[PDB]
Amino acid sequence: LHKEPATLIKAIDGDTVKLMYKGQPMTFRLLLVDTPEFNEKYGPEASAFTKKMVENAKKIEVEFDKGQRTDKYGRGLAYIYADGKMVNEALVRQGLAKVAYVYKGNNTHEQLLRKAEAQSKKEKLNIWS
């Protein structure tokens, strides 16, 4: 897998963000995670978390997996990095997302995120409190 450049257009919620990718605006859905919706418990904190992560980053990168690169809603499916740190993994580590929507062939970082979820649960963070 490899990292490609992108720039923030707009923070949306915990697991979606608007980025410019090869010069085109695009909504990205974070692979392998599920944040609560804004109106749900920890939704606002998930949105705040992702928003600050991507807004403070001097360098956003997108990393496609080996499978489907856009979902049925036209959203990009990727791992998103903010100054080399994976937003997907950071949300799970902080208990602001659950490992989820694990589909065969788009699951390269599954065990890395499950390891983060195990530590978050151990610490009873946020969703696991």
Ligand X SMILES: Cc1cn([C@H]2C[C@H](OP(=O)(O)O)[C@@H](COP(=O)(O)O)O2)c(=O)[nH]c1=O
114 in active site: no
Q: Give the footprint of ligand X on residues 23-42 (CB under 6 A).
A: 29, 31, 34
Q: Which of 45, 63, 75, 110 is catalytic?
A: 75
Question: What whole-number distance in Å separates Cα of residue 8 and Cα of residue 19?
Answer: 5
Binding letters toward Ca ion, positions 2-41, x by CB under 5 A:
-------------x------------------xx------
Total number of residues binding ligand X (CB under 6 A)? Answer: 9
CB-count burial class (<10 Å; 0-12, 13-18, 19+) for 124:
exposed
Burial 102-114 (b: 16+ CB within 10 A, else e): eeeebbbbbeebe
Rounded to an integer, what distance in angstroms lies between the CA atom of residue 119 and that of residue 20? 33
CB of 50 to ligand X, least distance (A): 12
Q: Which of 17, 62, 77, 82 is the binder for ligand X (CB under 6 A)?
A: 77
Residue 63 site contact among Ca ion, ligand X, none (CB < 5 to 8 Å, cut-off depends on kind): none
Q: Is 15 annotated as a binding residue?
A: yes
Pairing of strands 24-30, 76-82: parallel
Ligand-binding site membership of 83 (annotated): no
Tokens of 70: 């856009």
Task: Cite the active site residues.
Answer: 29, 37, 75
Q: Residues at the annotated binding site for Ca(2+)? A: 15, 34-35
